[PDB]
Write an enzyme that holds these catalytic residues in place. Sequence first.
Site, PDB file in Angstrom:
ATOM      1  N   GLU A 240      38.772 -20.555 -16.696  1.00  0.00           N
ATOM      2  CA  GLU A 240      39.070 -19.246 -17.084  1.00  0.00           C
ATOM      3  C   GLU A 240      39.680 -18.506 -16.262  1.00  0.00           C
ATOM      4  OE1 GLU A 240      35.599 -17.934 -18.926  1.00  0.00           O
ATOM      5  OE2 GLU A 240      36.159 -18.299 -21.059  1.00  0.00           O
TER       6      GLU A 240
ATOM      7  N   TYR B  18      60.482 -12.849 -23.738  1.00  0.00           N
ATOM      8  CA  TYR B  18      59.862 -14.056 -24.072  1.00  0.00           C
ATOM      9  C   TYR B  18      60.680 -15.333 -23.755  1.00  0.00           C
ATOM     10  CZ  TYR B  18      56.963 -17.397 -26.469  1.00  0.00           C
ATOM     11  OH  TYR B  18      56.370 -18.622 -26.967  1.00  0.00           O
TER      12      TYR B  18
ATOM     13  N   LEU C 206      19.664 -30.969 -23.379  1.00  0.00           N
ATOM     14  CA  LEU C 206      18.535 -30.299 -23.782  1.00  0.00           C
ATOM     15  C   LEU C 206      17.856 -30.706 -25.108  1.00  0.00           C
ATOM     16  CD1 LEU C 206      19.382 -26.529 -22.769  1.00  0.00           C
ATOM     17  CD2 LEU C 206      17.978 -28.330 -21.618  1.00  0.00           C
ATOM     18  N   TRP C 207      18.665 -31.698 -25.865  1.00  0.00           N
ATOM     19  CA  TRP C 207      18.372 -32.442 -26.883  1.00  0.00           C
ATOM     20  C   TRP C 207      17.129 -33.180 -26.301  1.00  0.00           C
ATOM     21  CZ3 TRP C 207      21.509 -31.917 -31.504  1.00  0.00           C
ATOM     22  CH2 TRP C 207      21.067 -32.571 -32.556  1.00  0.00           C
TER      23      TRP C 207
HETATM   24  C1  LIG Z   1      33.330 -25.456 -29.647  1.00  0.00           C
HETATM   25  C2  LIG Z   1      32.427 -26.255 -29.565  1.00  0.00           C
HETATM   26  C3  LIG Z   1      32.403 -27.637 -30.156  1.00  0.00           C
HETATM   27  C4  LIG Z   1      31.606 -28.616 -29.414  1.00  0.00           C
HETATM   28  C5  LIG Z   1      30.617 -29.445 -30.535  1.00  0.00           C
HETATM   29  C6  LIG Z   1      29.323 -30.343 -30.052  1.00  0.00           C
HETATM   30  C7  LIG Z   1      28.548 -30.549 -31.245  1.00  0.00           C
HETATM   31  C8  LIG Z   1      27.158 -31.315 -30.372  1.00  0.00           C
HETATM   32  C9  LIG Z   1      27.658 -32.442 -29.535  1.00  0.00           C
HETATM   33  C10 LIG Z   1      26.788 -33.262 -28.958  1.00  0.00           C
HETATM   34  C11 LIG Z   1      25.434 -33.228 -29.063  1.00  0.00           C
HETATM   35  C12 LIG Z   1      24.610 -34.470 -30.015  1.00  0.00           C
HETATM   36  C13 LIG Z   1      23.227 -34.828 -29.552  1.00  0.00           C
HETATM   37  C14 LIG Z   1      22.349 -35.260 -30.690  1.00  0.00           C
HETATM   38  C15 LIG Z   1      21.741 -36.969 -30.323  1.00  0.00           C
HETATM   39  C16 LIG Z   1      21.271 -36.860 -28.836  1.00  0.00           C
HETATM   40  O1  LIG Z   1      19.898 -36.776 -28.709  1.00  0.00           O
HETATM   41  O2  LIG Z   1      21.949 -36.902 -27.793  1.00  0.00           O
HETATM   42  C17 LIG Z   1      21.471 -36.587 -26.524  1.00  0.00           C
HETATM   43  C18 LIG Z   1      20.716 -37.705 -25.848  1.00  0.00           C
HETATM   44  O3  LIG Z   1      19.675 -37.348 -25.179  1.00  0.00           O
HETATM   45  C19 LIG Z   1      21.917 -38.444 -24.810  1.00  0.00           C
HETATM   46  O4  LIG Z   1      21.212 -39.664 -24.455  1.00  0.00           O
HETATM   47  C1  LIG Z   2      14.625 -24.231 -24.826  1.00  0.00           C
HETATM   48  C2  LIG Z   2      15.881 -24.252 -24.339  1.00  0.00           C
HETATM   49  C3  LIG Z   2      16.869 -23.168 -24.486  1.00  0.00           C
HETATM   50  C4  LIG Z   2      18.625 -23.387 -24.055  1.00  0.00           C
HETATM   51  C5  LIG Z   2      19.363 -22.212 -24.425  1.00  0.00           C
HETATM   52  C6  LIG Z   2      20.655 -22.586 -24.238  1.00  0.00           C
HETATM   53  C7  LIG Z   2      21.700 -21.370 -24.152  1.00  0.00           C
HETATM   54  C8  LIG Z   2      23.092 -22.028 -23.720  1.00  0.00           C
HETATM   55  C9  LIG Z   2      23.852 -22.452 -25.019  1.00  0.00           C
HETATM   56  C10 LIG Z   2      24.843 -23.254 -24.890  1.00  0.00           C
HETATM   57  C11 LIG Z   2      25.553 -24.092 -23.650  1.00  0.00           C
HETATM   58  C12 LIG Z   2      26.127 -22.997 -22.790  1.00  0.00           C
HETATM   59  C13 LIG Z   2      27.117 -22.200 -23.263  1.00  0.00           C
HETATM   60  C14 LIG Z   2      28.715 -22.862 -23.086  1.00  0.00           C
HETATM   61  C15 LIG Z   2      30.027 -21.989 -23.461  1.00  0.00           C
HETATM   62  C16 LIG Z   2      29.999 -20.837 -22.392  1.00  0.00           C
HETATM   63  O1  LIG Z   2      29.417 -20.869 -21.398  1.00  0.00           O
HETATM   64  O2  LIG Z   2      30.918 -19.982 -22.639  1.00  0.00           O
HETATM   65  C17 LIG Z   2      31.222 -18.868 -21.850  1.00  0.00           C
HETATM   66  C18 LIG Z   2      31.946 -17.903 -22.765  1.00  0.00           C
HETATM   67  O3  LIG Z   2      31.589 -18.108 -24.069  1.00  0.00           O
HETATM   68  C19 LIG Z   2      33.306 -18.274 -22.579  1.00  0.00           C
HETATM   69  O4  LIG Z   2      33.899 -17.869 -21.313  1.00  0.00           O
END
Ligand SMILES: CCCCCCCC/C=C\CCCCCC(=O)OC[C@H](O)CO
Ligand SMILES: CCCCCCCC/C=C\CCCCCC(=O)OC[C@H](O)CO
Lengths: 90, 97, 117
Positions: free
Chosen positions: B46, B63, B93-94
């Site tokens: 960013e 422009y 975290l999954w």
């Molecule tokens: C604007 C943001 C767009 C981004 C969209 C992202 C959508 C979620 C993608 C992946 C997580 C799925 C994970 C589910 C399966 C799972 O458990 O995967 C972990 C494993 O631990 C890996 O080994």
């Molecule tokens: C029990 C577990 C709790 C877990 C809590 C998870 C909280 C964070 C969520 C998603 C990924 C991080 C965010 C990725 C995108 C990000 O940092 O964007 C910055 C601004 O939105 C744009 O500069």
Amino acid sequence: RQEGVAVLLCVVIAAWLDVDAVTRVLLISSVMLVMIVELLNSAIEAVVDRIGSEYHELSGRAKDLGSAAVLIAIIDAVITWAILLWSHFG
Amino acid sequence: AWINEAAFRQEGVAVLLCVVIAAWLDVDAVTRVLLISSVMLVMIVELLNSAIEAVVDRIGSEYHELSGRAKDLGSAAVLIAIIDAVITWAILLWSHF
Amino acid sequence: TGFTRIIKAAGYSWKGLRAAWINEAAFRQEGVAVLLCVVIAAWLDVDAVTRVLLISSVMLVMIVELLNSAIEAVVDRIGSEYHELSGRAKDLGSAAVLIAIIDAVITWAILLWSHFG
Ligand SMILES: CCCCCCCC/C=C\CCCCCC(=O)OC[C@H](O)CO
Ligand SMILES: CCCCCCCC/C=C\CCCCCC(=O)OC[C@H](O)CO
Ligand SMILES: CCCCCCCC/C=C\CCCCCC(=O)OC[C@@H](O)CO
Ligand SMILES: CCCCCCCC/C=C\CCCCCC(=O)OC[C@@H](O)CO
Ligand SMILES: CCCCCCCC/C=C\CCCCCC(=O)OC[C@@H](O)CO
Ligand SMILES: CCCCCCCC/C=C\CCCCCC(=O)OC[C@H](O)CO
Ligand SMILES: CCCCCCCC/C=C\CCCCCC(=O)OC[C@H](O)CO
Ligand SMILES: CCCCCCCC/C=C\CCCCCC(=O)OC[C@H](O)CO
Ligand SMILES: CCCCCCCC/C=C\CCCCCC(=O)OC[C@H](O)CO
């Protein structure tokens, strides 16, 4: 260039340490990221200078934003090395 | 001199909060590093995107197609960085929780 | 107000990806390679941290590729004539792209080896 010296030293240390492949990838990538961000920052600086050597508000703004990017990347590297080494020697 | 802007404060704070959360989670060390670097990369990208935008505006207000293209390409970089952060956090975290 | 910035930036982003895709076979082929790697990583039987490293290493390639093309577009915007600093900007930007790619290849080679060797 003394940034390439910094890199080889990191690679050597990471090689020298007895860590698994994942840790070594993280240790080295974090250093490489600094290099990528420094190069992109230098590219932007080169463009700013190409436009003119005279001062301008937006020229300063560009250079300061680029330099903050490098700083965040260096901080990320320090954090990565501290965390992985603390865990390796835990 | 740029930290006093609503856009950077909002982006910065989200990243900061994520780093703080990651510092407190009960995860292993490799997972912790990945949670932290993925959001810090959002901030790095960013900042580089804003740097490029500043150079474009420096050139002038007239422009030009390439001026628009430079800014679009920078935004796309940020978008990919954000997706990478979401994917990183989701996968890790999954797995953990 | 924080929602309109998202919609706005998202639109710029799509136009960025679209222009890069339409304008160069090389970009299209890179995007194919990236998408392939992400799909592969998503289906491999590896731990979660390995999976993230495989995915984020190719995404970084795409991030640096796009920031570098942004820098090229600014340079070309200023002028097509030869200038030392113009050449230097592109040299530095290209060096950054190559580092990201080499790091991705090596990251994939190491992790796929460790998991198979
Ligand atoms: C604007 C943001 C767009 C981004 C969209 C992202 C959508 C979620 C993608 C992946 C997580 C799925 C994970 C589910 C399966 C799972 O458990 O995967 C972990 C494993 O631990 C890996 O080994
Ligand atoms: C029990 C577990 C709790 C877990 C809590 C998870 C909280 C964070 C969520 C998603 C990924 C991080 C965010 C990725 C995108 C990000 O940092 O964007 C910055 C601004 O939105 C744009 O500069
Ligand atoms: C999880 C993976 C996320 C994405 C990873 C990075 C992929 C980046 C590569 C390509 C994105 C799509 C580009 C737009 C497609 C496009 O322009 O089609 C042609 C039409 O526009 C013609 O009218
Ligand atoms: C627009 C570009 C998209 C590029 C990606 C297109 C998606 C398809 C990519 C690769 C398929 C080749 C490998 C197939 C092997 C297969 O069936 O394996 C299933 C098992 O491994 C599941 O455990
Ligand atoms: C975006 C569209 C997604 C479409 C997805 C279509 C399915 C793709 C599935 C797998 C890709 C092939 C690579 C993984 C195969 C695998 O398990 O290999 C384990 C080792 O023995 C060999 O590496
Ligand atoms: C901006 C302020 C930054 C200040 C930094 C310089 C001062 C640190 C000096 C000594 C370390 C004291 C011992 C602490 C050891 C330490 O951090 O251990 C980690 C855990 O042990 C991991 O589990
Ligand atoms: C992005 C803004 C999100 C705003 C809402 C956030 C809500 C709180 C969620 C998670 C905190 C961490 C909770 C788990 C702490 C944890 O893992 O503790 C184990 C051990 O006790 C550590 O030693
Ligand atoms: C800017 C200078 C940075 C200096 C370093 C600050 C790092 C702070 C981050 C997280 C706190 C976690 C502390 C533990 C780290 C660690 O290796 O813990 C083992 C595993 O994380 C869990 O077993
Ligand atoms: C626009 C965003 C598109 C996002 C595309 C990439 C998404 C990758 C997600 C999941 C891969 C892991 C799949 C599940 C792995 C798995 O089984 O993990 C649990 C196990 O139970 C652990 O033992």
